[PDB]
Symmetry: C3
Subunit: 225 residues, 3 copies
């Protein structure tokens, strides 16, 4: 009867409960024990973006890239490999220009020309965004109130944290990721697989990531011989 | 040629046609014959939320919970089990605090701190939302015009009805569901499975639902012995 | 170690790379060699919608349908088969009224009563939208700036192009599609399959498409005997 169905539903809920729990546990285990070889530090990227946040965001883009190439030669994609690629993740739509990416880090220019918002993603990685233009509203888990951030500010998305993010038209930022970068690909590609069906954008995304990986491998081989 | 491909496509469309049709028919059969044991009634929840809609929505939250505990003891989750959990469904992102849930009913606090909107879901359940703060725009199926609702109003999402819903930042409401509650889980979890990949939020969602079910089972056992 | 994992990840990225690439290649092959039997032309639909863009969009709807029936008898669905059906695709939510659809073309009334936006879709089809009311913001791939279009304007979504689209509440338009129409169904239904779970809307969508196909088949049989 009604009690039997309640018990069976509770059994199935406990089944999904322990599956999701152990999946989170494995995410924590893979992440905490993951490698931590760091070329950059988030304060370095944040100060460099905050210095040029008063410029037109495209002029800021160029000066940030030139400085990143001067201070970290061999770790930034050349001009021929820079490309604006749409990003559809967690219900929002923006675009990116990948500058650096490895197993443990990534650096990219991010933003949107449309009003958008959605889920931030939850992963074992520390993501930081320094706003060059526009507005960035963040709604943290466990709260009923959100906060808006402006050019010059830096939002630090902590490891294991989940937020709601919302950007206005013409918002652009410099983004630095640190942690277990591969564990973020599922979030980055989900809306392409199950919503947009934009397989050429998927092609673009894995192409620039593979190029960034090959750049790091080529530089690591040259630093040893 | 062109006529052959048109016929084959029409055959496949009829295939998807009869599959979706019989799936809807089974949804109607399971729902109409589902159980209907009711602890609350929607007018009770709506009047209680409308009375406190003039307060700060968090003060309203507390007074509504206290009143629901006084009038329905044994059917509201204790303070230790209350938690704000993100809800990603039908393209929108809000958050909930589950107070009561069974096979046939649920009562929760709902809202969002970001501008969001999307599909309401179509299921065999009668959902009603009494706005405490913010704005609630509803766009009904079969019409080209939408309506906006304000604090004190109650939107009644009818059984089998589908709407587009849109909430502004800082909109909060009291929500009561009545019907075949399990048939709504697929809509509630879809964007977590196929977009956000937020498995810890999924863990949170099934945990509070299982706790609410266990509360109802514990109370039903005590009312008999 | 770290180099081994980098190589393995690069191998898997190249795997996804060549899969998505050949899927795009097959999309191009099917599309370029697809049939091109055309009842309408986009300038015809655009001028007819632009003439009536100064009217109330519902009065414009009726006059456009009457004119399309007068100039293309046997290719427009009768009043009994006209229906507003929700469209959930690429993260946005609108609604449509299908007037004509074949293997190579389609004509429909489109719009939304809510603020929405998302991915446009990428397919081998040329889509054109003439705005009757509201605002249409388009963000093209490879750019950091978007453009807004107004009643009387026509946006032409080119073959293979991907954009971000965003519409304000009360935006309505006349839409004409030309190309390999079946290759667009996956984009049109994805958010229904993996987000909204609205199987009755899916039932509605394949019903009107099958009816439009059957209309074209019936007219083609009568034009020969
Ligand atoms: C998916 C994510 C991380 C989460 C960001 O969301 S955000 O709101 O915190 O900015 C968006 C974002 C944009 C670019 C994504 C990045 C994750 C790592 C990705 C997939 C690569 O290896 C190449 C491009 C990278
Ligand atoms: C999924 C749904 C019902 C549809 C609501 O959408 S709404 O626009 O009508 O408010 C959102 C909503 C929020 C909480 C959801 C509820 C359905 C039943 C759920 C999944 C439980 O057992 C626990 C939490 C409940
Ligand atoms: C999916 C798409 C094409 C892309 C449009 O997006 S848009 O931003 O370019 O307007 C939305 C749109 C609406 C109606 C869709 C159409 C594609 C072809 C569809 C599925 C049919 O056979 C029947 C209804 C048609």
């Amino acid at each position: 009867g009604r009690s039997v169905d309640t018990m069976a539903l509770w059994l199935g809920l406990r089944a999904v409960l322990v599956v999701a729990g152990l999946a989170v546990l494995l995410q924590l285990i893979r992440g905490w024990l993951s490698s931590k070889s760091y070329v950059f530090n988030r304060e370095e990227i944040a100060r460099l973006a905050k210095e040029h946040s008063g410029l037109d965001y495209e002029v800021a883009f160029s000066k940030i890239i030139v400085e990143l190439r001067k201070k970290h030669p061999g770790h930034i994609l050349q001009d021929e490999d820079l490309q604006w690629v749409f990003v559809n993740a967690g219900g929002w739509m923006g675009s990116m220009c990948l500058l650096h990416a490895s197993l443990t880090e990534y650096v990219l220019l991010f933003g949107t020309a449309v009003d958008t918002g959605g889920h931030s993603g939850r992963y074992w990685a520390e993501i930081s965004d320094t706003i060059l233009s526009g507005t960035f509203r963040q709604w943290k888990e466990g709260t009923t109130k959100s906060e808006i951030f402006y050019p010059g500010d830096t939002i630090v998305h902590e490891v294991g944290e989940a937020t709601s993010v919302q950007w206005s038209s013409g918002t652009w930022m410099v983004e630095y990721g640190r942690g277990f970068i591969p564990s973020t690909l599922a979030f980055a590609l989900a809306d392409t697989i199950f919503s947009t069906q934009d397989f050429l954008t998927l092609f673009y995304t894995v192409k620039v990531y593979s190029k960034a990986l090959l750049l790091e491998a080529s530089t690591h081989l040259s630093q040893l011989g």
